[PDB]
Amino acid sequence: MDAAEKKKIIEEYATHPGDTGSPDVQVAILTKRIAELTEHLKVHKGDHHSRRGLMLMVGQRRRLLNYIAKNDIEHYRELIARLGLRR
RNA sequence: AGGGCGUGAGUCGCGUGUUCUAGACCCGAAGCGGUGUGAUCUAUCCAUGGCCAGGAUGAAGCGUCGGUAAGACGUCGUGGAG
Numbered sequence: 001m002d003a004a005e006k007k008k009i010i011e012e013y014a015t016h017p018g019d020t021g022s023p024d025v026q027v028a029i030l031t032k033r034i035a036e037l038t039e040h041l042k043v044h045k046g047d048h049h050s051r052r053g054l055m056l057m058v059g060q061r062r063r064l065l066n067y068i069a070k071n072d073i074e075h076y077r078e079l080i081a082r083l084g085l086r087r
Numbered sequence: 088a089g090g091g092c093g094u095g096a097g098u099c100g101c102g103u104g105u106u107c108u109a110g111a112c113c114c115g116a117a118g119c120g121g122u123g124u125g126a127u128c129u130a131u132c133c134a135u136g137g138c139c140a141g142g143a144u145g146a147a148g149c150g151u152c153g154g155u156a157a158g159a160c161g162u163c164g165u166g167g168a169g
């Protein structure tokens with residue numbers, strides 16, 4: 001998250017070239033952040049405050065995915081298929 | 088002074104009684120000491136071999152599925168532990 005791969009993620013998950021805040025981009029960014037924080041917590045199992053931040057990110061991503069699936073179910077399926085298949 | 092002790096037959100053989108030192112009239116311990124013999128029984132150990140019909144039970148592990156942010160965990164199969 002030195003903004004390099006963040007911009008990369010924004011551009012390769014954007015719906016249109018100017019898109020930077022749509023639910024797809026938000027879910028992609030949140031998933032990358034959840035992965036990074038999961039690794040950090042695996043290193044530091046005792047970081048309860050960061051784990052709470054991780055849970056907040058998880059819930060936010062869940063609500064965004066719920067909105068996406070409520071609007072366009074096939075788009076939701078494609079997005080989650082790209083993003084870890086929702087296991 | 089009074090008193091104690093003292094004022095010629097012995098000695099050597101043989102026999103014999105008792106006795107001394109020797110096992111000492113004879114028999115009998117449990118045990119003590121010295122030096123050896125034994126681990127072909129048995130106790131433990133050491134090296135090197137053998138052996139344990141048959142039938143049960145179903146531990147880890149692994150895998151599937153479910154679960155989760157990752158899990159834990161659940162489920163099923165597999166597995167064959169003591």
Ligand SMILES: [Mg+2]
Nearest residue numbers: 117118119120
């Ligand atoms: Mg004595």
Ligand SMILES: [Mg+2]
Nearest residue numbers: 119120121122
């Ligand atoms: Mg002795």
Ligand SMILES: [Mg+2]
Nearest residue numbers: 118119120121
């Ligand atoms: Mg003796």
Ligand SMILES: [Mg+2]
Nearest residue numbers: 123124125126
């Ligand atoms: Mg000997």
Ligand SMILES: [Mg+2]
Nearest residue numbers: 126127128129
């Ligand atoms: Mg022997």
